[PDB]
Amino acid sequence: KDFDLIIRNAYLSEKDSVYDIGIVGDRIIKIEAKIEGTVKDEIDAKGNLVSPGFVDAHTHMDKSFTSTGERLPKFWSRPYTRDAAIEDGLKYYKNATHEEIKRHVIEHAHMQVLHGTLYTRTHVDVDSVAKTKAVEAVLEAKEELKDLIDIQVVAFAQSGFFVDLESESLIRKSLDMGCDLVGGVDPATRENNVEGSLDLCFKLAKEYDVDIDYHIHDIGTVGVYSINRLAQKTIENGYKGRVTTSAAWCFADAPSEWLDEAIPLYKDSGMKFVTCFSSTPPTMPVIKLLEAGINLGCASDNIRDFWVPFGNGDMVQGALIETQRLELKTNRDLGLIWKMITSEGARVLGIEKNYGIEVGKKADLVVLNSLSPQWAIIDQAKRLCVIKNGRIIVKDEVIVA
Amino acid sequence: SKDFDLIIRNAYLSEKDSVYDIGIVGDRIIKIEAKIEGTVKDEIDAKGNLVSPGFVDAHTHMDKSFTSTGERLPKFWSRPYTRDAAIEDGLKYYKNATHEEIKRHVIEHAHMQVLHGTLYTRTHVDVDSVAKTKAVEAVLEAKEELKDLIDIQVVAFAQSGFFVDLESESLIRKSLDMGCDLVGGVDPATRENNVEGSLDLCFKLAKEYDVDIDYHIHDIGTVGVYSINRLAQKTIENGYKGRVTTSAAWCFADAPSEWLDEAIPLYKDSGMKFVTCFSSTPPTMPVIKLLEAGINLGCASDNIRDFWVPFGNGDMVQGALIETQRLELKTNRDLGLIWKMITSEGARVLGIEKNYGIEVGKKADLVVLNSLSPQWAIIDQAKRLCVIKNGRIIVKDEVIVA
Ligand SMILES: [Cl-]
Ligand SMILES: [Cl-]
Ligand SMILES: [Zn+2]
Ligand SMILES: [Zn+2]
């Protein structure tokens, strides 16, 4: 047979036209207006958009779905604060079992792939109560999920290196077990030590030769200062391109000149950013960052836990949410959000060379039931088909792997 | 003696916080009991999930909906939104639009709404020197054909402005004579350039036909609040307490909070009602604060897939999620207030509250959801299982079966 799989009549946004896509093994081999040749399996996209797999660049798979089980979501009789949610986590992880955490990770991943997400980066709580229990469960589930979704795992010091003093050794072990990145939280308002927390993070990252993903939620000028120190140390440590800042809410309320001043530093350091659609501030300068050529991905953040009650693991839904948070309507702007859930995310994850609907790239694709990125955001139609490693894994809302 | 025309089994009801069977005869709820003895022909098992009254989309523009559709990309959206440019696109559209095209759009809009469990809506219809009464005629006609699916109130809406399009006054009078249910205008300040005159004219017309009022006030900041204050004061002077709605009211987001604090007693004294549309609700809109003060605040789609708003699925449960995200809400209490906005607050805006709710004696207009509670429905966005209007099943598993 000439192709293992052909997708017929696929509208491709980057080319602005309709094409047949021919696939062999896990690779795209041919993209032509009409493909002749024999073929084992076919999918007709019927003139609708086919897209690369969506990238959910920031999740917490380990503690997901912990709000579920009752008539009302658990934990949400009281308002959100970072420190209270940290406490709920310590209480939860005290009695949580390896199998419960694993089941949550798998459930999370299944929900993501049903919505066309084929790549994700998850953080995992590492602290003196969870120890490496969560890491173990996540790494194990990651192995079992290889044929559905690619997962990068961040060893994440949720309590703070200088607040939970067991964090440093537990993170080292976590990275020794095979976590892919390392990260901390709020060098200023959580750690009370910007220089020390950041320096420690880089030391650990260099010991295991891993990339960095840091949670910086601190608002205003203290947030921007924290990210500036991060970016400066990124350069000093020879880590250009290897560092991600997650959240960065501070760009919304810090004076705009602080961001204007910092952009060249972020470009020089190759700083990457992820904004999560469960918290992106309505005045976040998302479009401005993209127009400046800053690499900005998008993400679910927490799903149905003591941090965020919401979540469907659906990046197309997240795109709609972002348009509404940021008050966007033009085709251009909706197109930039679509980039955020696709090619920007790929770039954050470091997989851009293998990402996209181009000959030679990975056959990880989503056939949608809408005509274009803009219409898919607007109409929220369910995914028709999902393809991973050139194999069909989702058809009409069902996992068929 | 006679037996139920319809029973819904195992219905979780939010106001009672328990699971009940619901028995229906004709268009009315007759019995709500833990177990209704005996079987009937037409039954629906809710399987322990939430059953809710029909959702209220308290503000739509059915007449010009879906005009953005037809191509690979949405039409009209190569340029950013401004009120005045969208007014121009409308005048251009209505020049060549046919009675049948407008009607088809209205029906398509309504079908999309009922598929998502909306059983009551208030739509505005452009009345101006280009549309004339063509849109009104089409909407009133479609409204008659849709009675078994959805209740529609129709606002004769002077979109161009009474003092900008001078043919508006006479066209509105005929529109109301044809049977529109309410009258309204737009932006007394920045569109009409005449706050006293536009408002006084609107009340004169409203009194001539004994209809209620729904005014679009999109003007931001203190000019918006001033406009609404004048509206509320004239509401009292004209003996129209309870008969006036202010749509949008974006100005409450950016006007100083002490302006809203000062105005609240006036709004209560006038019985002013408000609608915020989830396609534009400003992120700092004091939604919770208005509700906690006992102000009546409903929710709505606004435009769907046109030259004003490209978005829209006519789905109030989706709108609820959008509002939680716009306003940064997470607590069960706050999500519960948003659910009130898409149900009982909307009913109150529309004036149907005496017949609205899952209570014995009320209208059997209901939605069976695939989620456990208002909060979980907002979060998980599951499709509607069943929709019931006038005690008859009209939607089953994403299909209109009426
Ligand atoms: Cl410091
Ligand atoms: Cl005036
Ligand atoms: Zn996070
Ligand atoms: Zn409107």
Coordinates of C-alpha atoms in Angstrom, one line a residue, chain A residues 45-359:
Chain A
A45 CA -12.6 15.9 6.6
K46 CA -15.2 17.1 4.1
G47 CA -13.6 20.5 3.5
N48 CA -13.2 21.3 7.3
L49 CA -10.2 22.4 9.2
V50 CA -7.5 19.9 10.1
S51 CA -5.0 21.2 12.6
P52 CA -1.9 19.9 14.4
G53 CA -2.5 18.6 17.9
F54 CA -3.2 21.3 20.5
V55 CA -0.7 22.1 23.1
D56 CA -1.8 22.5 26.8
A57 CA 1.5 24.0 28.0
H58 CA 0.7 24.0 31.7
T59 CA -1.3 21.6 33.8
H60 CA -1.4 19.9 37.3
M61 CA -2.4 16.4 36.4
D62 CA -1.4 15.0 39.8
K63 CA -4.1 16.8 41.9
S64 CA -6.8 17.1 39.2
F65 CA -10.4 16.0 39.8
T66 CA -10.0 16.2 43.6
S67 CA -13.0 18.6 43.7
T68 CA -15.3 15.9 42.3
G69 CA -17.5 13.4 44.1
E70 CA -20.4 15.4 45.5
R71 CA -23.4 17.4 44.4
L72 CA -21.4 20.6 44.8
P73 CA -17.7 21.0 44.0
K74 CA -15.6 20.3 47.1
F75 CA -13.4 23.1 48.6
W76 CA -15.4 26.0 47.1
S77 CA -17.4 27.2 50.1
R78 CA -14.5 29.7 50.6
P79 CA -12.7 32.1 48.2
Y80 CA -9.3 31.4 46.5
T81 CA -6.0 32.3 48.0
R82 CA -2.7 30.8 47.0
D83 CA -1.7 29.9 50.6
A84 CA -5.0 28.3 51.6
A85 CA -4.9 26.1 48.4
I86 CA -1.3 25.1 49.4
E87 CA -2.7 24.0 52.7
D88 CA -5.6 22.0 51.1
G89 CA -2.9 20.3 49.0
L90 CA -0.8 19.3 52.0
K91 CA -3.9 17.9 53.7
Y92 CA -4.9 16.0 50.5
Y93 CA -1.5 14.5 49.8
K94 CA -1.2 13.2 53.3
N95 CA -3.8 10.4 52.6
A96 CA -3.8 10.3 48.8
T97 CA -2.7 6.9 47.4
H98 CA -0.4 6.1 44.5
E99 CA -3.4 4.5 42.6
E100 CA -5.7 7.5 43.2
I101 CA -3.2 10.0 41.9
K102 CA -2.4 7.8 38.9
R103 CA -6.1 7.4 38.1
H104 CA -6.5 11.2 38.1
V105 CA -3.6 11.6 35.8
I106 CA -5.1 9.1 33.3
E107 CA -8.6 10.6 33.5
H108 CA -7.0 14.1 32.9
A109 CA -5.1 12.8 29.8
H110 CA -8.2 11.0 28.4
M111 CA -10.2 14.2 28.7
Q112 CA -7.4 16.1 27.0
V113 CA -7.0 13.7 24.0
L114 CA -10.8 13.7 23.5
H115 CA -10.5 17.4 22.8
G116 CA -7.6 17.1 20.4
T117 CA -4.7 17.9 22.8
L118 CA -1.7 15.7 22.0
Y119 CA 1.0 17.4 24.0
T120 CA 1.1 18.7 27.5
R121 CA 3.5 19.9 30.2
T122 CA 2.3 19.1 33.8
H123 CA 3.7 20.2 37.1
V124 CA 3.8 17.8 40.0
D125 CA 3.8 18.8 43.7
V126 CA 7.1 17.9 45.3
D127 CA 7.2 18.8 49.0
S128 CA 7.7 17.1 52.5
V129 CA 4.2 15.6 52.5
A130 CA 3.8 14.4 48.9
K131 CA 7.5 13.5 48.8
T132 CA 8.1 11.7 45.5
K133 CA 4.8 9.8 45.7
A134 CA 3.1 12.1 43.1
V135 CA 6.1 12.1 40.9
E136 CA 6.1 8.3 40.9
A137 CA 2.5 8.1 40.0
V138 CA 2.8 10.7 37.2
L139 CA 5.9 9.1 35.6
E140 CA 4.2 5.7 35.7
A141 CA 1.0 7.0 34.1
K142 CA 3.1 8.9 31.5
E143 CA 4.6 5.5 30.4
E144 CA 1.1 4.0 30.0
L145 CA -0.2 7.0 28.0
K146 CA 2.6 7.2 25.4
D147 CA 0.3 6.1 22.5
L148 CA -2.2 8.9 23.3
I149 CA -0.4 12.0 24.5
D150 CA 3.2 13.3 25.0
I151 CA 3.8 14.6 28.5
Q152 CA 6.7 16.7 29.9
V153 CA 6.9 16.6 33.7
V154 CA 8.0 19.5 35.9
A155 CA 9.4 18.7 39.3
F156 CA 7.6 21.6 41.1
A157 CA 8.5 22.8 44.6
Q158 CA 5.0 23.9 45.4
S159 CA 5.6 24.8 49.1
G160 CA 8.8 26.8 48.4
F161 CA 12.5 25.9 48.7
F162 CA 13.0 28.3 51.6
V163 CA 9.7 27.5 53.3
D164 CA 9.7 23.7 53.1
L165 CA 13.4 22.9 53.7
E166 CA 13.0 19.3 52.6
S167 CA 12.2 20.5 49.1
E168 CA 15.8 20.7 47.7
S169 CA 16.5 17.0 48.4
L170 CA 13.1 15.8 47.3
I171 CA 13.4 17.7 44.0
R172 CA 16.9 16.2 43.3
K173 CA 15.4 12.7 43.7
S174 CA 12.4 13.6 41.6
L175 CA 14.8 14.7 38.8
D176 CA 16.9 11.6 39.4
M177 CA 13.7 9.6 38.8
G178 CA 13.3 11.2 35.4
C179 CA 11.3 14.5 35.6
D180 CA 12.0 16.6 32.5
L181 CA 12.1 20.1 34.0
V182 CA 12.4 21.8 37.4
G183 CA 10.4 24.8 38.8
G184 CA 9.4 26.8 41.9
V185 CA 6.8 29.3 43.0
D186 CA 6.8 33.1 43.7
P187 CA 10.4 33.9 44.7
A188 CA 9.1 37.1 46.4
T189 CA 5.8 36.6 48.3
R190 CA 6.2 32.9 48.9
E191 CA 9.9 32.3 49.4
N192 CA 10.8 35.8 50.7
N193 CA 14.1 35.4 48.9
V194 CA 14.3 36.2 45.2
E195 CA 18.0 35.8 44.6
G196 CA 18.3 32.6 46.7
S197 CA 15.3 30.7 45.3
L198 CA 16.2 31.5 41.7
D199 CA 19.9 30.6 42.1
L200 CA 19.0 27.3 43.8
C201 CA 16.6 26.5 40.9
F202 CA 19.4 27.1 38.4
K203 CA 21.8 25.0 40.4
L204 CA 19.5 22.0 40.4
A205 CA 18.6 22.5 36.7
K206 CA 22.3 22.4 35.8
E207 CA 23.0 19.4 37.9
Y208 CA 20.5 17.3 35.9
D209 CA 20.8 19.2 32.6
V210 CA 17.0 20.0 32.6
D211 CA 15.0 23.0 31.4
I212 CA 13.1 25.3 33.9
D213 CA 9.4 26.3 34.3
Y214 CA 8.7 28.8 37.0
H215 CA 5.3 29.8 38.5
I216 CA 5.3 33.5 39.0
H217 CA 1.8 34.7 40.1
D218 CA 2.9 37.7 42.0
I219 CA 1.1 40.9 40.8
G220 CA 2.4 44.3 39.8
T221 CA 6.0 45.5 39.9
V222 CA 7.1 42.7 42.3
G223 CA 6.2 40.2 39.7
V224 CA 7.9 42.0 36.9
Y225 CA 11.0 42.4 39.0
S226 CA 11.0 38.7 39.8
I227 CA 10.8 37.8 36.1
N228 CA 13.5 40.3 35.2
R229 CA 15.8 38.7 37.8
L230 CA 14.9 35.3 36.3
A231 CA 15.7 36.4 32.8
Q232 CA 19.0 38.0 33.8
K233 CA 20.1 34.8 35.6
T234 CA 19.0 32.9 32.5
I235 CA 21.6 34.8 30.5
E236 CA 24.3 34.6 33.3
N237 CA 23.9 30.8 33.5
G238 CA 24.0 30.1 29.7
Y239 CA 20.3 29.0 29.7
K240 CA 19.0 31.1 26.9
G241 CA 15.9 29.4 25.5
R242 CA 15.6 26.9 28.3
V243 CA 13.4 28.8 30.7
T244 CA 9.6 29.3 30.9
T245 CA 7.7 31.7 33.1
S246 CA 4.2 30.5 33.8
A247 CA 1.2 32.9 34.6
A248 CA 3.0 36.2 34.6
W249 CA -0.2 38.0 35.8
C250 CA 1.9 41.0 36.7
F251 CA 2.1 42.1 33.1
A252 CA -1.6 43.0 33.5
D253 CA -1.3 45.5 36.3
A254 CA 2.4 46.6 36.3
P255 CA 2.9 49.9 34.5
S256 CA 3.2 49.4 30.8
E257 CA 6.6 51.0 30.7
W258 CA 8.0 48.3 32.9
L259 CA 7.0 45.7 30.3
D260 CA 8.3 48.0 27.4
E261 CA 11.7 48.2 29.2
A262 CA 11.8 44.4 29.9
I263 CA 10.9 43.1 26.4
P264 CA 14.5 43.4 25.0
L265 CA 15.8 41.5 28.0
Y266 CA 13.2 38.7 27.4
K267 CA 14.1 38.5 23.8
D268 CA 17.9 38.4 24.6
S269 CA 17.3 35.7 27.2
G270 CA 14.8 33.8 24.9
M271 CA 12.3 33.8 27.8
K272 CA 9.2 31.8 27.0
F273 CA 5.8 32.4 28.6
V274 CA 2.6 30.5 29.3
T275 CA -0.8 32.2 30.2
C276 CA -3.5 29.9 31.5
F277 CA -7.1 30.5 30.4
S278 CA -8.4 29.8 33.8
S279 CA -6.7 33.0 35.1
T280 CA -5.5 35.2 32.2
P281 CA -6.1 38.8 33.5
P282 CA -8.5 40.7 31.2
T283 CA -5.9 43.4 30.7
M284 CA -3.1 41.0 30.0
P285 CA -1.1 42.4 27.0
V286 CA -1.4 39.1 25.1
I287 CA -1.6 40.6 21.6
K288 CA 1.2 43.1 22.3
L289 CA 3.5 40.3 23.5
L290 CA 2.9 38.3 20.4
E291 CA 3.4 41.3 18.1
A292 CA 6.7 41.9 19.8
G293 CA 7.7 38.3 18.8
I294 CA 7.6 37.0 22.4
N295 CA 6.8 33.3 22.6
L296 CA 3.5 32.9 24.5
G297 CA 1.7 29.6 24.9
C298 CA -1.7 28.8 26.4
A299 CA -3.0 26.3 29.0
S300 CA -5.7 24.9 31.3
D301 CA -3.8 25.2 34.5
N302 CA -5.6 23.2 37.3
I303 CA -8.7 21.1 36.5
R304 CA -11.4 20.5 39.1
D305 CA -9.3 20.8 42.3
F306 CA -8.8 23.1 45.3
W307 CA -7.1 25.7 43.1
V308 CA -9.5 25.9 40.2
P309 CA -13.0 24.3 40.2
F310 CA -13.3 24.6 36.4
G311 CA -11.9 22.5 33.6
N312 CA -12.6 20.4 30.5
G313 CA -9.1 20.0 29.1
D314 CA -10.4 21.5 25.9
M315 CA -8.0 24.1 24.3
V316 CA -10.6 25.2 21.8
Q317 CA -12.9 26.0 24.7
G318 CA -9.9 27.8 26.3
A319 CA -9.5 29.8 23.1
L320 CA -13.1 31.1 23.4
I321 CA -12.5 31.9 27.0
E322 CA -9.5 34.0 26.1
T323 CA -11.3 35.9 23.4
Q324 CA -13.9 36.8 26.1
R325 CA -11.4 37.6 28.9
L326 CA -9.4 39.8 26.5
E327 CA -12.4 41.2 24.5
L328 CA -11.2 40.1 21.0
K329 CA -13.4 39.8 17.9
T330 CA -11.4 40.4 14.7
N331 CA -10.3 37.4 12.5
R332 CA -6.7 38.4 13.0
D333 CA -7.0 38.3 16.8
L334 CA -8.8 35.0 16.9
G335 CA -6.1 33.7 14.6
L336 CA -3.4 34.8 17.1
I337 CA -5.2 32.9 19.9
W338 CA -5.3 29.8 17.6
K339 CA -1.5 30.1 17.2
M340 CA -1.3 30.2 21.1
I341 CA -3.0 26.8 21.4
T342 CA -0.9 25.3 18.6
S343 CA 2.5 26.6 17.3
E344 CA 3.3 28.9 20.2
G345 CA 2.7 26.0 22.6
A346 CA 4.9 23.7 20.5
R347 CA 7.7 26.3 20.7
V348 CA 7.3 26.5 24.5
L349 CA 7.6 22.8 24.7
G350 CA 10.6 22.7 22.3
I351 CA 9.0 20.4 19.7
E352 CA 8.6 23.0 16.9
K353 CA 10.9 21.2 14.4
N354 CA 8.5 18.2 14.5
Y355 CA 5.3 20.2 14.8
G356 CA 2.9 21.3 12.1
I357 CA 1.0 20.0 9.0
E358 CA 4.1 19.9 6.8
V359 CA 5.8 17.1 4.9

